[PDB]
Every structure is written in structure tokens, then in C-alpha cells.
Amino acid sequence: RVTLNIATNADSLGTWFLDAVSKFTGGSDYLVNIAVDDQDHTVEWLRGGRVLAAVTAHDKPVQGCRVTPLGVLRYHATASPDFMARHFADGVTPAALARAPGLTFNQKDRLQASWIRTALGEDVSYPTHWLPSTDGFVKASLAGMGWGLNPVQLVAEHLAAGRLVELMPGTPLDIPLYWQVNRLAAERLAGLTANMVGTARVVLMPV
């Protein structure tokens, strides 16, 4: 069998990516080698031919690559009811955010900072746990350990059930995603592309 090297961000792997990839592998003989990038190396990997294709938040064409917008991955800033009670008893304020334990994926994760900037109109430096795991983020949020930005696909049911609540309802953070494919592999991998684009169309918000 031929093995295809493909990159994805963790949050897509934790949601929709395998749903797309499995549709493709189910109808072909290809194997996949899935590289998970959350240190922003995808552009270098594409340039160096270390992967042939990638789901990335990077819009800008790696020179040569074919680029297709996939839609928007929406995140909500969420915590448990007990977390809110203990840390935001008199609201989500800059003072409170300076003391409440956040969740941060790694040193390149700007989502909580961005959400604060947008929600409160200023930057607040927040104390944080460090948790480089999409599924771990959700578990930590549910367990009352911290607040953080989680993809809507992983928290919609929890929100509906009241197991999580939004720090500030109606303040989502949207990250557009792109599918980048090495131009020399693109025709060969048209089936994979069709499955990525088609699956993202159903799951992500439209561009």
C-alpha cells in the first residue's frame, strides 16, 4: 500500500478530520500517516514535502500548493457551573480573569487571550493550567478545573444539558480552516480532497 502523509491541527483531529479521512480510506488502498501540528510547523512541512496535504488555519498559499477554504471552526469559552460560581461569582470581569484558572493548550495558543480581548475590550493576563489536548480541554472544563476555548462540536451537548456554560453567551471565536495540497499530488488525491471538503461543508460553518 502507499502511505499518505497528511497534517492536521489537534482540534480538527478531535472533531471532524477522521470522519473525512475514513470516507477516503474506506474506498481506496491508501494508508495514512497523520501528523498533528500544534506548533505551527505545517507550512514548513508542506514546503519540505514532509506532508502532502494539511488542514491548517494558514490561508496563505505555501508557494505551489492548491488551497481550498473549508469553513469556520467555532469555539466557545466554557467552564462548569461550579467553576463559574467559585471564580466568577460577581461576573466575568478583568479582576476575576486575573485570578481564575484558565486552560491553555501550549505557548502558541492565543485563543483564550483573543477571546478576552474581544469579550472585555482589553487584554488581561490570566493564570493557567497547560493542557496540550483537545479532548483533555473538554474533560478539564467539565471537571471544573479551568475555563477555556473549546470547539462547538465537542461542547454543544454539554451546553444544552447545563454541564458547561458559556462565560459570556454570544461571544464565539471563529477560526477559518483551509485544506492545502501539494500541487503534484493534487489530482491523484482528488478523492481525499472531495471527502475533506464535503465533510467540512456539513460540519463547519460556511465561509
149 binds Ca ion (CB under 5 A): yes
Helices of type H across 98-168? 111-120, 134-142, 152-161
CA separation, residue 118 to residues 38, 52, 172, 177 (Å):
23, 35, 10, 20
155 binds Ca ion (CB under 5 A): no
15: nearest Cα among 200, 206, 201, 147: 200
Strand partners, 175: 73
DSSP-based three-state secondary structure for 37: coil
84 binds Ca ion (CB under 5 A): no
Query: Of 113-121, 134-142, 161-169, 181-189, which part binds Ca ion (CB under 5 A)?
Result: 134-142
Give the nearest distance from C-beta 132 to its own copies in angstroms.
Answer: 6
The binding site for its own copies (CB under 8 A) comprises 1, 3, 13-14, 18-19, 21-22, 25-26, 31-36, 101, 127-136, 139-140, 143-145
Q: Is 149 annotated as a binding residue?
A: yes
152 binds Ca ion (CB under 5 A): no
Our CB check for its own copies shows the closer of 132 and 191 to be: 132
- Backbone angle region of 86, left / alpha / beta, with phi > 0 → left and psi within -120 to 50 → alpha: alpha
Partner touching 149 among its own copies, Ca ion, none, CB below 5 to 8 Å by kind: Ca ion
Q: Which residues are annotated as a binding site for Ca(2+)?
A: 149
